[PDB]
Amino acid sequence: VTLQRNITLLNGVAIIVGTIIGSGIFVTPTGVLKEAGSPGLALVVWAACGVFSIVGALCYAELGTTISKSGGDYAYMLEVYGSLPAFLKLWIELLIIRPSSQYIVALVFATYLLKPLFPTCPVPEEAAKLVACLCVLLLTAVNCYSVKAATRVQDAFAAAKLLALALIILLGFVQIGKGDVSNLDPNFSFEGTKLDVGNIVLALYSGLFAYGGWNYLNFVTEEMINPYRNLPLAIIISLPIVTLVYVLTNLAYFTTLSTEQMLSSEAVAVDFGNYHLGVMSWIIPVFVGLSCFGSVNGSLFTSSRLFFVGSREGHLPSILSMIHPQLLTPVPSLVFTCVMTLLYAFSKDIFSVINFFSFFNWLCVALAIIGMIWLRHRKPELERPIKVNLALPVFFILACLFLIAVSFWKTPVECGIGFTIILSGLPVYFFGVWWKNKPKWLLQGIFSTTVLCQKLMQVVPQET
Amino acid sequence: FTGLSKEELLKVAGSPGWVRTRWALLLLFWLGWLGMLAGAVVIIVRAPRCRELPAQKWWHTGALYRIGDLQAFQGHGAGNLAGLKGRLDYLSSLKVKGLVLGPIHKNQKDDVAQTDLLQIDPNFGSKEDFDSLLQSAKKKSIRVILDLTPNYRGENSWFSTQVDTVATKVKDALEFWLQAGVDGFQVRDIENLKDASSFLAEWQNITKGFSEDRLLIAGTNSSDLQQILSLLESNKDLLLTSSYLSDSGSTGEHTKSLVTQYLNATGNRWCSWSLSQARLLTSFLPAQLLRLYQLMLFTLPGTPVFSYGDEIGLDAAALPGQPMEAPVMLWDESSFPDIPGAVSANMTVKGQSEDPGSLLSLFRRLSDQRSKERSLLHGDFHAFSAGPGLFSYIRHWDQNERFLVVLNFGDVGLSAGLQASDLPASASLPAKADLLLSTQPGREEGSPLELERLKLEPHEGLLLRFPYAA
Ligand SMILES: Nc1cc(COc2c(Cl)cc(C[C@H](N)C(=O)O)cc2Cl)c2oc(-c3ccccc3)nc2c1
Ligand SMILES: *[C@@H]1O[C@H](CO)[C@@H](O[C@@H]2O[C@H](CO)[C@@H](O)[C@H](O)[C@H]2NC(C)=O)[C@H](O)[C@H]1NC(C)=O
Ligand SMILES: *[C@@H]1O[C@H](CO)[C@@H](O[C@@H]2O[C@H](CO)[C@@H](O)[C@H](O)[C@H]2NC(C)=O)[C@H](O)[C@H]1NC(C)=O
Ligand SMILES: *[C@@H]1O[C@H](CO)[C@@H](O[C@@H]2O[C@H](CO)[C@@H](O)[C@H](O)[C@H]2NC(C)=O)[C@H](O)[C@H]1NC(C)=O
């Protein structure tokens, strides 16, 4: 009877785990080994990354259940800060950050789906972009048809991802059960004192990329079932499981492949399937590709919800956030998300666009969690169904400031260009909303376009 | 903007001719998706496939290091095998995937009865120590190759008396050392033992029948191509090292002629590229050509063999009272207790490790580049004509980075004048090529250099790379 509420505690976990686990573990697990060298240092650094994600996620879940509003990481900023910083963050997200991770994940799915066809030579790009576009279009159609199908497919693909990780760790443990260990028992493989200056912090920086979705489920809330109970439970179920899985599969990778040959690799998580099980090895990479597929859906979901909430505040045009009855799905928002994700298919590179704003999420987490302390200082009487040990938000602020400082010091030119891009977006809001009382030469055309689009798509505005 | 009316909008959108419009648009979208899928499938099918993988053995993926006597490599006092356990890390720094450890079996005169290759000499060490060395090398991913030349002290290197006894002793010690754990064998001075072809074929047969990852090396002192080719007739998996390569010291095109002739006669097969069997570069070359040969031997299509002291440019003529065959290794300034100042600071491994213009740095970079790069590992080799004294060739496997090496053996500088006009169009060199290194410092590195304005100072070489071109 409700408008749209079909997400339980066995679904939300699917969304979070699908968003977290992409190509970070299969494709690029060698950065930490290159930085540190010793397997023990890699294990302890992955454990530290996991606990850092835990302490961030608990605070973010407490903040989300404090202000139970859809569109996380932006609703908190809008309610604390106001109208300008929230619009800046939303505009940069909808322009350069949100519809680029989805495209990169679609590209990696397309690339690792066709790997058995071309085991050695690189997959042609004219056939790798089209598969990503096919995946994006099909997933957008599925999401626009209904939400129940999207939830079911996301849950199935999260289950497949966990099954694949279980299979690889089981094979590794079976090899452990043999008479060969190939582990550094007598002495340390490496000391890892310092590469150039980055003794430890470089491992932390390139050890937090495997995570990142610890904070998405908040982009969906107010559509869950009993959010005050199932949001912190979903986070608590999802996060320690994923960090334990990361640590254990890293141990398997170290104990099944030698350091020297695996360090000099470019397409990791294929030689593992080739060496051990030999014939029919294509079951390892193809399934991995399927993994990435599901993740896109997850991200796609939240993306739509984000643009459903921004236009609620007049930040985005009112044409969006106009649901379609008899299906209760935001058709214009999903179409906009799919089109904007496709729009980046013309970038012939993969390194740019997203690497300028690596510091952006790190600063935004701090900017949205200082709102926690500000709200605690101003209005300490809002309902709080769960409480954790205090003084952790300030520790996370210290960690976030350290992380943005490390990112700036490691690469200042790219961060400076990113800062220029974010700062240059103010004009679009200065002369986009503030310039009210416009004459009747532009508003009537916008209204006409809105009504014809409504007729074309058969949508109605949200009812209360 | 404020929310269009719910009911009239629903009721108006029922007129025939416009409800079918959305059906037509949906069908158009689905047929466009199907068309794009079909186009992607067509593009996938019509594309070149990965050629193959040759499934190379262990000795195809790196150099080989020869240690004739451990006494000179280590120093006075620590003449045992366990001392190499303290030095293997250094070798792992050089990135050498082999170690041709010299003969260790007992021998003190031209006798035949009490001189046997069954067990190790007591002075060298112990069997348990040798097994410890084997396990340490295995942990370090280094394969130790043994040597079984029956006689190495006297002039008669292979017991010119009856040869049945020595053949039986070799065939009996072979499987002994196989179950011991060694990964290869070498026999030197193959011209002394009679009817060498049959014995070499038998030894290769037994060694390759024991396992698929075993290696046997032969060493001959003949520079004639016909003799070498006749030796390689009955057996083909042989690795043969001969002094045939050098044959020079004042000629530049001769090296290209010999290399191309050998490759053509042997059928573009696997061969070992070495200057000699138990000698180093400085014996046959002056100090002004070492870098050129170090660059040539680390790019030719085969397994390169170097002797000890061949990366620091060790030379035996620069010191007095030094044996020519096995000079001591200049580890540091404490090479000799006396003459404190005869040696220099650039003749030691410590003084050459960090010097950008040292030989050891070039050796390390070249070995690292050869060990990992696939085109240098098992890529096809193609040579074309060049100027009067230029040796230029291309290494290219399937689709990886192609490598172009050009060396100048002349005594004066000259322009390159690169032109092939005969190579297949698949790997045609472009007009723009990158750069890797230069043997003699005084040039740029890391940035593209045009191939039409190339100039070469005397005694130089270039290791340009270019990517796969459609
Ligand atoms: N400012 C910003 C914020 C986020 C959000 O945080 C993350 C997300 Cl939403 C997903 C992943 C990937 C995932 N952890 C995996 O296992 O691959 C990492 C991070 Cl830090 C970005 O994500 C990505 C991304 C994710 C996958 C492929 C290519 C790029 N770029 C981001 C830039
Ligand atoms: C290795 O030597 C063996 C022993 O001769 C060869 O095996 C056979 O040689 C006999 C000689 O009478 C022939 O009758 C057989 O036809 C040979 N069989 C094989 C296996 O070819 C063998 O040819 C040699 N090669 C290897 C490496 O097996
Ligand atoms: C040695 O290389 C030469 C040069 O190719 C070959 O000699 C002739 O090469 C031409 C063109 O490749 C062929 O049409 C002739 O049939 C070759 N004649 C000979 C001698 O075969 C030769 O093929 C190569 N090897 C040898 C000596 O046979
Ligand atoms: C080591 O570096 C020194 C620095 O130049 C070289 O010293 C020259 O030695 C050559 C012959 O060895 C002489 O012709 C020069 O007069 C020396 N110059 C100086 C200033 O010492 C030396 O050649 C380098 N390598 C060797 C061979 O020791």
Side-chain angles (χ1 to χ4, degrees):
Chain A
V1 284
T2 82
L3 166 139
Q4 174 44 278
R5 262 178 186 254
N6 296 250
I7 305 159
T8 89
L9 85 87
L10 273 160
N11 209 310
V13 51
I15 282 155
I16 305 191
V17 177
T19 294
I20 285 167
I21 313 188
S23 99
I25 181 62
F26 307 114
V27 166
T28 172
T30 84
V32 161
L33 204 47
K34 165 213 66 55
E35 148 42 24
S38 96
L41 211 58
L43 260 56
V44 302
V45 85
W46 278 83
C49 301
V51 313
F52 173 83
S53 277
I54 298 314
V55 314
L58 283 154
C59 293
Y60 227 76
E62 178 148 38
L63 167 69
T65 192
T66 286
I67 309 128
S68 174
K69 186 147 306 307
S70 196
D73 304 60
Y74 160 85
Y76 322 131
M77 163 156 326
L78 179 100
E79 175 278 347
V80 170
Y81 271 32
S83 166
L84 195 84
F87 186 89
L88 265 187
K89 148 82 149 70
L90 180 51
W91 186 78
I92 220 64
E93 201 90 345
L94 85 84
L95 184 84
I96 195 193
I97 272 157
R98 172 69 58 240
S100 176
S101 48
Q102 309 169 320
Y103 183 76
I104 294 186
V105 173
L107 203 37
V108 80
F109 149 81
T111 285
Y112 264 37
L113 198 81
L114 306 169
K115 187 60 58 194
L117 264 281
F118 309 94
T120 293
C121 39
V123 202
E125 283 338 284
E126 300 110 9
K129 291 207 169 334
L130 261 53
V131 174
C133 291
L134 294 180
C135 164
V136 160
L137 257 51
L138 175 62
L139 276 196
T140 286
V142 152
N143 280 7
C144 173
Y145 182 76
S146 169
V147 176
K148 153 186 64 69
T151 49
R152 294 291 260 201
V153 74
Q154 164 65 84
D155 203 17
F157 272 105
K161 210 174 300 193
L162 266 204
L163 201 73
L165 269 170
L167 160 71
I168 178 175
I169 187 55
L170 187 127
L171 167 160
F173 198 39
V174 162
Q175 172 179 106
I176 285 294
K178 218 74 61 173
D180 297 285
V181 298
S182 301
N183 218 49
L184 263 306
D185 314 335
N187 214 9
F188 284 55
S189 187
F190 198 36
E191 216 180 86
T193 87
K194 205 171 69 162
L195 289 201
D196 202 40
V197 187
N199 43 307
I200 303 302
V201 281
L202 263 294
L204 269 286
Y205 187 76
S206 296
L208 271 43
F209 164 75
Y211 306 80
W214 58 274
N215 61 99
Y216 259 53
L217 203 75
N218 300 1
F219 284 81
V220 165
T221 186
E222 287 285 309
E223 273 201 43
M224 209 166 328
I225 292 312
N226 193 11
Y228 298 60
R229 155 52 200 281
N230 308 274
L231 197 169
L233 178 49
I235 296 274
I236 283 296
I237 287 309
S238 151
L239 255 286
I241 288 310
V242 79
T243 183
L244 210 168
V245 161
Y246 274 141
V247 162
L248 168 58
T249 192
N250 220 45
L251 203 153
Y253 255 69
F254 289 157
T255 199
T256 59
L257 261 63
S258 65
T259 311
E260 170 64 78
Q261 68 116 6
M262 146 203 164
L263 187 102
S264 184
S265 270
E266 75 70 9
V268 202
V270 294
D271 38 37
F272 192 99
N274 297 13
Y275 161 69
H276 307 71
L277 61 100
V279 194
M280 84 153 184
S281 170
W282 49 261
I283 192 43
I284 273 288
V286 165
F287 214 80
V288 152
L290 267 307
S291 147
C292 298
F293 180 88
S295 97
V296 154
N297 175 248
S299 168
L300 205 81
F301 203 66
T302 74
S303 323
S304 37
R305 293 314 174 262
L306 178 80
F307 309 148
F308 181 84
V309 177
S311 198
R312 308 294 288 292
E313 321 285 19
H315 275 226
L316 267 303
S318 165
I319 166 60
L320 292 95
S321 82
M322 261 208 215
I323 325 162
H324 162 78
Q326 331 101 28
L327 290 159
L328 288 322
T329 36
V331 180
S333 164
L334 276 168
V335 160
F336 176 78
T337 294
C338 156
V339 158
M340 201 65 58
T341 300
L342 283 208
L343 219 40
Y344 276 136
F346 314 126
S347 91
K348 321 198 273 213
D349 43 9
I350 210 54
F351 221 64
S352 44
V353 162
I354 194 49
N355 259 4
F356 299 161
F357 284 82
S358 77
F359 74 127
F360 180 76
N361 79 347
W362 286 132
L363 52 95
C364 269
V365 167
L367 260 52
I369 203 192
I370 57 106
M372 212 165 178
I373 313 279
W374 269 37
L375 189 128
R376 199 181 279 253
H377 182 242
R378 305 254 206 267
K379 192 120 147 55
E381 322 66 9
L382 267 163
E383 61 295 340
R384 300 154 46 149
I386 210 186
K387 307 157 185 50
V388 299
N389 238 355
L390 259 192
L392 273 186
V394 63
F395 170 74
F396 205 69
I397 289 290
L398 172 142
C400 282
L401 259 48
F402 205 94
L403 255 293
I404 48 193
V406 163
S407 51
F408 265 101
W409 187 27
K410 169 60 157 150
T411 312
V413 279
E414 304 329 297
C415 289
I417 318 144
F419 219 86
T420 289
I421 310 194
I422 166 178
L423 263 201
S424 70
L426 277 142
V428 83
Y429 184 40
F430 184 55
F431 275 171
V433 178
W434 144 252
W435 196 0
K436 302 270 194 34
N437 65 267
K438 294 241 192 163
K440 280 308 291 149
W441 78 314
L442 190 56
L443 331 171
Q444 90 287 6
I446 297 314
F447 195 56
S448 198
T449 55
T450 322
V451 282
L452 51 94
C453 171
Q454 210 148 346
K455 141 153 183 305
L456 278 142
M457 225 155 305
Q458 269 276 51
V459 282
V460 307
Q462 155 87 348
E463 60 269 346
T464 179
Chain B
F1 208 84
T2 66
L4 200 62
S5 311
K6 166 66 213 67
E7 191 66 330
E8 36 266 69
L9 154 66
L10 185 129
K11 69 179 279 320
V12 66
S15 87
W18 299 106
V19 52
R20 201 70 157 192
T21 307
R22 96 185 63 136
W23 275 85
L25 260 201
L26 203 48
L27 262 281
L28 171 130
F29 156 84
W30 277 127
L31 77 92
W33 187 81
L34 281 153
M36 215 172 48
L37 171 132
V41 165
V42 152
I43 278 307
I44 272 283
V45 153
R46 314 211 291 131
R49 294 310 220 280
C50 158
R51 173 173 158 198
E52 267 313 326
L53 266 206
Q56 63 214 10
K57 315 272 176 61
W58 62 267
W59 63 91
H60 296 164
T61 88
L64 272 162
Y65 208 87
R66 287 194 288 219
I67 298 149
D69 48 338
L70 310 104
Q71 193 74 270
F73 191 66
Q74 286 174 148
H76 265 47
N80 310 9
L81 311 99
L84 265 281
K85 214 176 315 177
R87 286 282 209 297
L88 284 141
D89 75 344
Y90 166 54
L91 266 52
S92 311
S93 81
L94 280 182
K95 247 45 171 170
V96 279
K97 323 227 165 291
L99 201 159
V100 185
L101 164 155
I104 43 181
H105 53 77
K106 65 207 77 50
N107 194 0
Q108 72 281 330
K109 212 62 71 196
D110 306 64
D111 72 88
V112 194
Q114 59 274 56
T115 291
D116 54 351
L117 55 165
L118 258 301
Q119 73 294 30
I120 321 185
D121 189 278
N123 166 266
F124 269 112
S126 49
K127 204 83 51 173
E128 311 77 60
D129 193 37
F130 184 34
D131 293 304
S132 91
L133 169 133
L134 258 302
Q135 63 154 40
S136 195
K138 178 166 210 93
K139 152 141 39 71
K140 294 236 173 185
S141 76
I142 270 172
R143 326 291 178 101
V144 158
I145 296 170
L146 198 82
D147 193 344
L148 318 152
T149 300
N151 214 7
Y152 42 84
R153 322 206 164 281
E155 322 96 310
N156 210 165
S157 171
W158 221 321
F159 284 153
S160 53
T161 180
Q162 69 279 344
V163 301
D164 38 43
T165 48
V166 290
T168 49
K169 274 203 211 143
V170 165
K171 85 164 271 183
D172 293 328
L174 256 167
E175 58 277 334
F176 182 169
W177 288 121
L178 271 305
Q179 342 278 326
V182 308
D183 319 330
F185 284 81
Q186 173 184 257
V187 284
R188 282 190 304 109
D189 274 316
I190 219 71
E191 296 317 313
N192 208 232
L193 163 144
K194 334 192 171 83
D195 61 282
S197 316
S198 270
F199 289 120
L200 277 183
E202 205 283 330
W203 290 320
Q204 180 70 286
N205 257 28
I206 164 176
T207 312
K208 294 301 298 142
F210 181 92
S211 190
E212 199 186 351
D213 259 359
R214 255 66 193 184
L215 168 141
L216 186 128
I217 322 166
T220 169
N221 57 308
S222 87
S223 162
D224 282 338
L225 171 64
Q226 314 291 335
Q227 214 185 89
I228 291 167
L229 172 62
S230 316
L231 257 180
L232 279 199
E233 276 278 354
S234 308
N235 39 15
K236 196 63 63 61
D237 204 280
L238 212 55
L239 223 66
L240 202 138
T241 76
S242 42
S243 37
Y244 148 82
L245 189 40
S246 75
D247 211 354
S248 298
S250 46
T251 42
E253 209 271 321
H254 266 268
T255 60
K256 168 202 204 50
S257 69
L258 322 161
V259 168
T260 309
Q261 246 198 352
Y262 184 73
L263 271 177
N264 191 38
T266 205
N268 254 281
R269 218 181 312 257
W270 208 253
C271 43
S272 85
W273 284 119
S274 151
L275 265 279
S276 291
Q277 36 168 77
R279 284 319 276 306
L280 67 165
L281 314 191
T282 84
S283 279
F284 321 98
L285 327 167
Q288 53 188 339
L289 286 143
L290 286 208
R291 303 163 151 272
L292 205 56
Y293 276 81
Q294 283 212 3
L295 190 36
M296 153 201 286
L297 293 181
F298 263 118
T299 38
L300 280 170
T303 295
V305 188
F306 299 98
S307 188
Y308 83 98
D310 213 272
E311 71 280 42
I312 77 184
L314 171 143
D315 172 340
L319 291 74
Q322 190 67 243
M324 175 142 73
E325 320 87 339
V328 317
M329 181 55 148
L330 306 177
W331 279 123
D332 44 59
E333 38 274 28
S334 69
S335 313
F336 205 70
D338 290 326
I339 44 173
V343 311
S344 160
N346 56 350
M347 300 190 176
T348 71
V349 314
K350 302 144 53 71
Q352 297 219 26
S353 40
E354 81 278 64
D355 189 15
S358 60
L359 207 30
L360 203 146
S361 43
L362 180 60
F363 190 91
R364 288 207 155 128
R365 297 169 69 205
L366 275 177
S367 181
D368 274 274
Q369 183 94 10
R370 153 85 150 93
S371 294
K372 53 175 266 284
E373 164 79 8
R374 197 101 60 93
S375 189
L376 287 191
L377 272 204
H378 51 251
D380 276 83
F381 161 96
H382 274 111
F384 37 61
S385 164
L390 281 204
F391 192 24
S392 44
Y393 45 88
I394 306 187
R395 322 276 335 266
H396 53 78
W397 153 238
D398 169 43
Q399 231 163 63
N400 289 63
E401 316 176 27
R402 282 105 167 88
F403 278 79
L404 192 138
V405 201
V406 49
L407 330 172
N408 157 34
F409 281 93
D411 221 353
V412 291
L414 88 159
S415 69
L418 270 162
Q419 60 215 344
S421 316
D422 48 13
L423 282 197
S426 49
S428 286
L429 63 144
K432 260 155 86 49
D434 306 359
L435 202 142
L436 261 300
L437 62 88
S438 169
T439 87
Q440 279 189 346
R443 209 176 269 264
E444 78 91 9
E445 185 268 353
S447 36
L449 153 57
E450 310 97 17
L451 279 178
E452 274 328 291
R453 319 279 308 259
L454 250 181
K455 56 106 177 178
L456 276 156
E457 40 185 342
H459 302 338
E460 210 210 322
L462 300 142
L463 190 39
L464 310 97
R465 112 189 64 186
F466 29 96
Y468 174 68

